[PDB]
Amino acid sequence: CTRFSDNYDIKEELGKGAFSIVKRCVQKSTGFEFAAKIINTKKLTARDFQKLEREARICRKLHHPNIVRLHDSIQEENYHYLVFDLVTGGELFEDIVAREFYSEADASHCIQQILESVNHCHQNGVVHRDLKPENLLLASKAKGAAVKLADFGLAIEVQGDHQAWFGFAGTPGYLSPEVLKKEPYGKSVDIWACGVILYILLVGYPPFWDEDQHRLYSQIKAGAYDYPSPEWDTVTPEAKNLINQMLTVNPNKRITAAEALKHPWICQR
Amino acid sequence: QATLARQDTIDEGGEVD
Ligand SMILES: Nc1ncnc2c1ncn2[C@@H]1O[C@H](COP(=O)(O)OP(N)(=O)O)[C@@H](O)[C@H]1O
Ligand SMILES: [Mg+2]
């Protein structure tokens, strides 16, 4: 078809994934702005195609202010376009590095939004499998800005608490122990990634890190992190308590999104 | 030391039913 080129005018660069070029675009008939995730289909196997339609299907199922909305999904002979609502505040990643870290108040507020979005996924039978700051976008651009959960390229359907081997996918520093152990996993993997994110928000570097990737995974599997002084000296014990529950190596013992949104540090305000 | 950096996504598959 030619539905996209006819109805949209492509504009500027916004961001890139491992296989995606995302660009701003304007719906010609309305002058409304959107984000066009463009993907070369000539390069893709039948599996990657099924992943692409899977992403589209999951995005549609999810309707929430803190989840990116899908406006349209168009196929052309050599490219596929996923037209999302534009979000112009940039990646949460960009903001953390610009500010080094967030105050406990900004962190709490930010992680609350993240948790509300992933909780929505879980209650709707979705596990994202790829929570990280570069997949979290800011609405306003600067300060109090609403966070929007994006990138469902690896999301899949799970129902309840049951865990199965859904394959080896995600992002190294954010991967949970049970995935790295090649054990059956489920929704709880997203909370691990959140714990990693919260830790990043509070001091601006990840809790699991190593030059050698094999060692990094070792660290993640053993839940080997700490709170080095002086960075964590001023940080409240309750803030740390929330992280500890999220970075619980055993997923059945791991805090859920729901019972993380209750946590004092999040809710004692 | 640890530095917050962009990490690329991976999917090596291997899903078993
Ligand atoms: N709706 C959006 N508005 C503005 N920028 C967006 C956007 N959706 C995605 N982006 C940017 O494009 C990048 C890649 O998008 P993403 O959905 O994660 O594609 P992927 N699955 O290949 O990683 C994002 O990191 C982000 O910076
Ligand atoms: Mg991404």
Q: Give the separation between CA A62 and CA A116, rounded to whole angstroms.
A: 13
DSSP string, B1-17: ---------EE------
Q: Give the separation between CA A220 and CA A87, rounded to whole angstroms.
A: 32
Q: Which atom of ligand 1 is nearest to the CA of A88?
A: 4
Resolution of the PDB structure in angstroms: 2.2
Find the angle CA(A243)-CA(A168)-CA(A253) to the nearest 5 degrees: 35
What is the number of alpha carbons within 13 Å of residue A97 lying toward its C-beta? 11
Query: Is the Cβ pair B12, A167 closer than 8 Å?
Result: yes
Tokens of A198: 């919260």
Catalytic (active-site) positions of A: 130
First CA to last CA distance, chain A: 52
Tell me whether A17 touches chain B (CB under 8 Å).
yes
At A10 the three-state DSSP class reads strand
Query: Is the Cβ pair B10, A134 closer than 8 Å?
Result: no
Instruction: Please tell me the distance in Å from A7's CA to the nearest CA on chain B.
Output: 31
Query: Is the Cβ pair A169, B11 closer than 8 Å?
Result: yes
Tell how far the Cα of A160 is from the centroid of ligand 1, in angstroms. 28
H-run or E-run covering A4? helix A3-7
Q: Give the separation between CA A129 and CA A132, rounded to whole angstroms.
A: 10
Contact A89 CB / ligand 1 (< 6 Å): no
What domains lie within chain A, and their CATH numbers?
1-86 (3.30.200.20), 87-269 (1.10.510.10)
Contact A14 CB / ligand 1 (< 6 Å): yes
Experimental method of this PDB entry: X-ray
Place of tokens 């990840």: A206
